[PDB]
Design a binder for this molecule. Structure first.
Ligand SMILES: O=P(O)(O)OC[C@H]1O[C@H](OP(=O)(O)OP(=O)(O)O)[C@H](O)[C@@H]1O
Ligand SMILES: O=P(O)(O)OC[C@H]1O[C@H](OP(=O)(O)OP(=O)(O)O)[C@H](O)[C@@H]1O
Ligand SMILES: [Mg+2]
Ligand SMILES: [Mg+2]
Lengths: 363, 357
């Protein structure tokens, strides 16, 4: 049987070879074996002890070789994981996603989720945000959407086509689609080290109709490989890879941000958006419950305005501006700002989110 | 509590760094943490699953970094395992051991044990062989579970040959037995056997290794673990942890680091293929050792492959013991040991000794 401990062992030995003898398609086939093996051991017997040993061995070996940081390997690992995912089937406005890899050791405000909601109230944009709950961070995108008043377990591959028509904003919670990421959930906790799984999230979008996306990465080293990976997983999707120089998987509200355009490169600074810089310690997460209240009451209610130099508001506005600019095919950042500001203060941003919470409520 | 998953993880993280940050002393501490975690292993628990996940990860990462093939790491690994062994206590002739790492993928005749027994028939030599080999000495009429740290001191005074079965001393190696099976890849544990001798009085030893690459680092490791032991590391170019009966063998001489080469021609023997020197299993290997080799049925000149193979390995051990490289003289003493009946008397005395325990 190809779906065996013996087949996984043979893949691990190719990683122990000098130099490593494991191809990108080998990685794909190895991950399917792992996902098969882990789906079947629902116990604390010797078989699950043996399987956990070989899965740990393989993933650790992979991490040490650093082959899991090459575009073609990341691309193939995403493909293998998607084979245990529930994909959304639709019938054929710019549709965008905005999502970071996480793993930057920052506990910043949930700015991707927040920028997705504000973008979704601009005319001609539709936002289909895919995301998860927090691993290393204090507040995740998925933690925020739940405290925002939405029952995310009602949103699945069978219910997204119902929501699709009359929503400018949608949020898809990763673990209700990706049963494969669920199978490796326990062993990832036990390993306590980063593996190939830590960078796959942004590339598991289960809706093929997304046209453009901003993908945040935690390192400069990874960004160019992640740019190439996104080309392979999302062919003919126009996409930004962003890296904040402070070490942030988002457009940084302090110092500069590099953007990989798919390889084209350009730099961003808050001043290009006509905003003051703000320390990350002023843009912190206040936990998911208080984050819901900051987003809903301070930002979405229009309590603060452009020019108030309110850090979190500025931070959400800038990241919204970049999503707009991407959607229109220009780099007029101060125009993106104006369009983001109008989405808040018109009430469009908050209505877009409320229509989503209501549409999910009626399932 | 230092002996925890959190401490082991902190060691794994140093191995993932660029470049690695795990010291040889760090490896010594990680091995004590692994040995602790494994023996206190709550069966059927999520905790068990997690421990095995972390131990597998650390050993795999250590293997991929190749730090487990560096002298100082091998030596610190052996010392960590030895903290869990029974050690033999002896008060106050050259005392030798001969043992390979295994892992050469060969299934040749048990020549280490055979040469140990023949060498123990030569005057001025005492042989305290340590190994895992262990089936052959068992089928020779020998109760190996009566040979332990408590009985070895009684056997010592009046035996020229002794055999110590590793798993009756090295309780540490027992704790990692199961994760080693599950792993199915080589780890640091694969090369520790020769460096866990429980008797500190052993003066000189031949340690065979499976690879040319490991050999030089294994020589330096032996020097760290066995300081003021005169030692030969040996590698058969065919890929053998023994002096090869076919082609060349390289020897790393650590004498308190020198390198020379051996060939059967230098012992006055013909070459033989490994196919012609195969193991017939432990039962028949004992019939062959006792009834054919030790009984004197074969002679220097018959070109009998297994006999030549044993004779050449005894001669290297004799020369090491004597502080010279007169290989042909070593063959003379080996041939004398067999045909005087001294080699067989040495084994018989050990077998009867163990029976009296
Ligand atoms: O490993 P961690 O650092 O905790 O990262 C966790 C989350 O980071 C990403 O946030 P995303 O860009 O979706 O959302 P946000 O900007 O709203 O936080 C992604 O959804 C991960 O689940
Ligand atoms: O390659 P493996 O299957 O792991 O076999 C390895 C064995 O080789 C060694 O034998 P030793 O040199 O002690 O004695 P021998 O020559 O009599 O076999 C050692 O005692 C191991 O148990
Ligand atoms: Mg983000
Ligand atoms: Mg041997």
């Amino acid at each position: 049987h190809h779906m065996s401990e013996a087949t996984l062992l043979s893949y691990t030995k190719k990683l122990l070879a000098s130099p490593p003898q494991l191809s990108s398609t080998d990685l794909h086939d190895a991950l399917l074996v792992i996902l098969s093996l882990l789906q079947k051991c629902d116990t604390n017997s010797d078989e699950s002890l043996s399987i956990y040993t070989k899965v740990s061995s393989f993933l650790t070996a992979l991490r040490v070789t650093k082959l899991d940081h090459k575009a073609e390997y990341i691309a193939e690992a995403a493909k293998a994981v998607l084979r245990h995912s529930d994909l959304v089937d639709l019938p054929l406005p710019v549709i965008l996603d905005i999502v970071g890899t996480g793993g930057d050791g920052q506990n910043t405000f949930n700015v991707s989720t927040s920028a997705a909601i504000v973008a979704s109230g601009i005319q001609g944009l539709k936002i289909c945000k895919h995301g998860g709950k927090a691993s290393t961070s204090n507040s995740g995108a998925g933690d925020l959407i739940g405290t925002l008043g939405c029952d995310m377990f009602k949103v699945n591959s069978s219910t997204v086509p119902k929501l699709w028509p009359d929503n400018t904003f949608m949020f898809l919670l990763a673990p209700f689609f990706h049963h494969g990421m669920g199978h490796v959930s326990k062993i990832r906790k036990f390993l306590g080290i980063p593996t190939v799984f830590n960078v796959l999230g942004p590339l598991l979008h289960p809706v093929s109709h997304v046209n453009k996306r901003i993908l945040g990465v935690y390192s400069k080293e990874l960004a160019p490989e992640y740019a190439k990976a996104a080309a392979l997983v999302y062919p003919g999707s126009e996409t930004f890879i962003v890296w904040g120089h402070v070490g942030l998987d988002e457009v940084s509200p302090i110092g500069k941000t590099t953007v990989w355009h798919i390889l084209k490169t350009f730099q961003l600074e808050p001043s290009m958006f006509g905003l003051e810089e703000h320390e990350l310690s002023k843009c912190a997460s206040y936990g998911p419950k208080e984050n819901a209240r900051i987003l809903k009451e301070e930002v979405l209610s229009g309590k603060y305005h452009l020019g108030d130099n309110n850090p979190i508001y500025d931070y959400i506005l800038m990241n919204t501006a970049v999503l707009y600019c991407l959607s229109q095919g220009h780099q007029n950042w101060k125009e993106g700002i104006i369009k983001a500001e109008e989405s808040i203060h018109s009430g469009n941003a908050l209505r877009s989110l409320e229509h989503f919470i209501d549409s999910v409520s009626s399932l």
